[PDB]
């Protein structure tokens, strides 16, 4: 019972069963999808056919594509419900510039790494506003507001963050920015020449104040999550890792596994994968940041188009990790228990037939509840 066998089993079962790996009864998925979708039912003509119109276009049996939910399922299977709950009580560590702290936390044992990556979401817009008209509860968040006596940052939680400017300073800036198009505009315009006008000088000065204050304000928001499984190896040079992920805008863990991207990245070596992951958080070249982000986290085949154009990674990123040991027997029994649940409640000769029965039983439960509230 190796750690490698654990990798092959969870890869095999996710590929074959998709969302059924969570062990949720299909009736519950259909009932919960029903109460969610009861508003989208067209109440004009034939209601019995209008309910089936919503059931046919359902996606309750397609797997989650949230990266965090995928990581939650990996931990649940490899560590167990109780072991996963203890793992999330652990605290993340910021990955070092070279990744040494992570390279030095894999002592040739069956290990599970969980990763959370943040993007720095600093403000890029500003607006002049009078204090009497400034309502933080309704105003646009993640924005600079230049009042006649104060310069503030309205963070994503609707809190007023003071940027340390005096009334005399803000009064000068407030009164120098007079062009109507510049009352509600952007920070860091490339065409603002501070030597051509007193307005552009004030706008450039405000941008410099905001950049200096924002370096010390927590604009970090979690943007991606995944896990890395590093099984035990015979030799010190035979050890490899396996990254597992879904991605919100792109793919599921089933598609990840189906494309063998876990094994393709495994061939980079442990030091090779960590080197790119560490470079992702240290580089200041947004082009290098984009291609590394695409190489590591894109669905298989989209590495070159994942982070181009509008998806270019212009913001700083930081990579955080946490590590814990895996018991293969616990993981293989957790996987076998899911197989028992699948074989008992949704029987079939092959995996494909069991998934279709699961979907049918989820669809009829959705129809039953939708009809029990609309017929």
């Amino acid at each position: 019972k190796t750690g490698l066998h654990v990798h092959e089993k969870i890869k095999h079962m996710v590929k074959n069963y998709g969302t059924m790996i969570t062990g949720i009864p299909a009736e519950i998925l259909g009932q919960n999808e029903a109460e969610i979708s009861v508003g989208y039912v067209k109440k004009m003509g034939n209601m019995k056919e209008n309910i089936a119109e919503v059931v046919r276009k359902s996606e309750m049996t397609q797997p989650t594509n949230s990266a965090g939910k995928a990581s939650n399922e990996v931990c649940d299977l490899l560590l167990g419900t109780e072991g996963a709950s203890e793992f999330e009580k652990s605290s993340y560590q910021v990955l070092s510039g070279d990744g040494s702290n992570l390279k030095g936390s894999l002592p040739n044992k069956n290990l599970l790494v969980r990763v959370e990556m943040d993007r720095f979401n600093a403000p890029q817009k500003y607006q002049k506003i009078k204090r009497e008209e400034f309502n933080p509860e309704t105003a646009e968040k993640n924005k600079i507001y230049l009042l006649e006596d104060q310069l503030v940052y309205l963070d994503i939680f609707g809190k007023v963050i003071d940027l340390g400017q005096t009334s005399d300073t803000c009064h000068r800036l407030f009164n120098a920015i007079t062009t109507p198009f510049y009352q509600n505009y952007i920070l860091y315009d490339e065409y603002i020449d501070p030597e051509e006008s007193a307005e552009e000088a004030a706008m450039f000065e405000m941008g410099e104040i905001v950049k200096a204050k924002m370096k010390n304000i927590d604009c970090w928001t979690a943007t991606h999550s995944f896990t890395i499984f590093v099984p035990e190896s015979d030799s010190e040079d035979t050890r490899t890792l396996y990254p597992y992920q879904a991605y919100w805008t792109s793919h599921t863990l089933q598609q990840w596994f189906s494309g063998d991207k876990d094994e393709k990245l495994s061939r980079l070596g442990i030091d090779g994968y960590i080197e790119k992951l560490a470079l992702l958080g240290t580089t200041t070249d947004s082009k290098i940041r984009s291609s590394i982000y695409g190489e590591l986290f894109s669905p298989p085949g989209k590495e070159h188009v994942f982070c181009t154009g509008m998806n270019e990674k212009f913001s700083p990123l930081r990579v955080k990790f946490k590590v814990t040991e895996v018991n293969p027997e616990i993981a293989l029994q957790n996987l076998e228990e899911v197989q028992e649940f699948i074989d008992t409640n949704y029987p079939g000769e092959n995996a494909k037939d069991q998934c279709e029965l699961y979907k049918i039983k989820a669809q009829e439960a959705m129809t039953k509840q939708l009809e029990m509230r609309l017929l």
């Binding site: 969610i36 991606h224 919100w248």
Partner: protein
């Protein structure tokens, strides 16, 4: 006040919030309890999608209301 967030798999969690709290504030509290990046969550209240720049008061979400956490993006 308490609000409830329910998922497709039946799980329900209780969040401690103010009516003036932003949707990004609610997603961060979900990150604290479930470890899900706010960039990879979607919140629904009474069939309507909650946008990130808004607050719970913009949708008349009150005490002990139930939100829906959607963990599969479906668009276009």
């Amino acid at each position: 006040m308490q609000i409830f967030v329910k998922t497709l798999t039946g799980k329900t969690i209780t969040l401690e919030v103010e009516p003036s709290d932003t949707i990004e504030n609610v997603k961060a509290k979900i990150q604290d309890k479930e470890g899900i990046p706010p960039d990879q969550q979607r919140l629904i209240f009474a069939g309507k999608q909650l946008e990130d720049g808004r607050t719970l008061s913009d949708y008349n979400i009150q005490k002990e209301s139930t939100l829906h956490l959607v963990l599969r993006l479906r668009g276009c």
